[PDB]
């Protein structure tokens with residue numbers, strides 16, 4: 001039934017970088033393998049004059065040594081032939097934080113209430129994702145509307161990630 005091949009996933013039509021800019025609170029996430037931001041996650045997206053999108057993001061993360069630090073992360077997005085699909089090069093302002101290059105797809109957003117992001121880091125041989133992560137972001141760090149939760153749930157099902165997300169606390173700790 002369900003097509004779970006990554007190449008089949010619908011993304012936001014006519015994605016608008018400039019409209020996406022601003023503050024996005026992470027309200028729920030699906031984690032990938034390995035280290036990952038844990039909670040108190042807020043991203044700030046920017047687009048410069050020449051249309052280049054970037055973002056900073058802050059969140060608590062536990063390092064291999066169980067320290068729970070506030071990470072200040074930086075990403076720069078490279079446009080692709082699909083306006084909703086980017087390559088995100090990222091790093092932290094501390095040198096010990098993870099650095100990498102991930103797909104960054106805007107699965108859906110209405111720009112002023114919610115967004116659903118996705119990254120597949122590794123494809124299975126069948127074209128499904130072997131190692132994904134996904135954030136549900138909000139403009140307002142309260143809960144969402146029933147009507148916006150239902151839409152978010154539909155987008156999670158499109159990604160074959162239904163029931164795989166956890167809610168994210170916001171309770172001080174970071175910057």
Ligand SMILES: CC1=C(/C=C/C(C)=C/C=C/C(C)=C/CO)C(C)(C)CCC1
Pocket residue numbers: 035036037043044055056057061063071073074075090091096097098117135
């Ligand atoms: C940069 C950035 C993002 C991803 C951050 C990641 C993937 C951080 C991982 C941090 C680690 C593992 C720290 C421990 O060393 C998201 C998608 C939120 C969008 C905003 C910009």
